Amino acid sequence: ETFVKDIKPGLKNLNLIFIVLETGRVTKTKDGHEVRTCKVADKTGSINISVWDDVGNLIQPGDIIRLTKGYASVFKGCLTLYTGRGGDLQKIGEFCMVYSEVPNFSHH
Amino acid sequence: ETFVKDIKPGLKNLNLIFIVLETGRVTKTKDGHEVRTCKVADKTGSINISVWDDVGNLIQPGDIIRLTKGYASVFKGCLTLYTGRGGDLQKIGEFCMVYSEVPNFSHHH
């Protein structure tokens, strides 16, 4: 497999599994596009991915995602992942909240 | 049952079921004791509660808790719940994290 530590500026056809650590806040380009920076990672480290428009709304921290045919470049100083137009982002994992009753555990 | 909106300063023997919205933050005294103030609520509204030392530290957001014999005062200008002596906090509900495999959901479906 490919690892985040092995990612450098100019890399191409990146096939990479990662987990979302952070979902940054969305900014707007000159042409009305919504762009959002996410901090994603594997055990070998973290990296930024730039995500565009509605894809941005489909991502939460904890999400396990497979990137296909991605590429890396520098944007405003930061190393950044991008989805290739002939590629894909695939969610293969997520963490969910489940309610559980508790037998009157006392804090004291 | 009692509801947050009906709580005034000086009201004692407060029995109240609430959910924790914010675990809030920690004030530490010079004698080494910590109090963390949380933001809790019911359908009628929210309110602050201060908890000392170990009591409030496996309090998590989403927790459903019952306070017995609590009392209401003013702290840092805000209406605040305290646990009165002879009182208790009981965790009766919680939300826990579980993993969920996703069968290949393309983000460009």
Swiss-Prot record, chain A:
* Chief subcellular location: nucleus
- According to its record, what are the GO cellular component terms? chromosome, telomeric region; cytosol; nucleoplasm; nucleus; site of double-strand break; SOSS complex
Q: Which UniProt keywords apply?
A: DNA damage, DNA repair, DNA-binding, Nucleus, Phosphoprotein, Ubl conjugation
Domain of life from the UniProt record: Eukaryota
Mention one GO molecular function: G-rich strand telomeric DNA binding
- Residues of the DNA-binding region: 19-89
Where in or outside the cell? Answer: Nucleus
Q: Which GO terms describe its biological process?
A: DNA damage response; DNA repair; double-strand break repair via homologous recombination; establishment of protein localization to telomere; mitotic G2/M transition checkpoint; positive regulation of telomere capping; response to ionizing radiation
| PTM note | Phosphorylated by ATM in response to DNA damage. Phosphorylation prevents degradation by the proteasome, hence stabilization of the protein and accumulation within cells. Ubiquitinated in a FBXL5-dependent manner, leading to proteasomal degradation.
Q: Which residues form a coiled coil?
A: none
Main role?
A: Component of the SOSS complex, a multiprotein complex that functions downstream of the MRN complex to promote DNA repair and G2/M checkpoint. In the SOSS complex, acts as a sensor of single-stranded DNA that binds to single-stranded DNA, in particular to polypyrimidines. The SOSS complex associates with DNA lesions and influences diverse endpoints in the cellular DNA damage response including cell-cycle checkpoint activation, recombinational repair and maintenance of genomic stability.
Q: How does it assemble?
A: Component of the SOSS complex, composed of SOSS-B (SOSS-B1/NABP2 or SOSS-B2/NABP1), SOSS-A/INTS3 and SOSS-C/INIP. SOSS complexes containing SOSS-B1/NABP2 are more abundant than complexes containing SOSS-B2/NABP1. Directly interacts with ATM, SOSS-A/INTS3 and RAD51. Interacts with INTS7.
Q: Which family does it belong to?
A: Belongs to the SOSS-B family. SOSS-B1 subfamily.
Q: State the protein's name.
A: SOSS complex subunit B1
Q: From which organism does this entry originate?
A: Homo sapiens (Human)
Q: Which gene encodes it?
A: NABP2
UniProtKB/Swiss-Prot annotation, chain B:
- Is DNA repair included in the keywords of this UniProt record? yes
Q: Which residues form the signal peptide?
A: none
Q: Is this entry keyworded DNA damage?
A: yes
**What's the superkingdom here?**
Eukaryota
Q: How is it modified after translation?
A: Phosphorylated by ATM in response to DNA damage. Phosphorylation prevents degradation by the proteasome, hence stabilization of the protein and accumulation within cells.
Which residue ranges does UniProt annotate as crossing the membrane? none
- Protein name in the entry: SOSS complex subunit B1
> What is the name of the gene encoding this protein?
NABP2
Q: Which residues of the full protein are shown?
A: 4 to 109 of 211
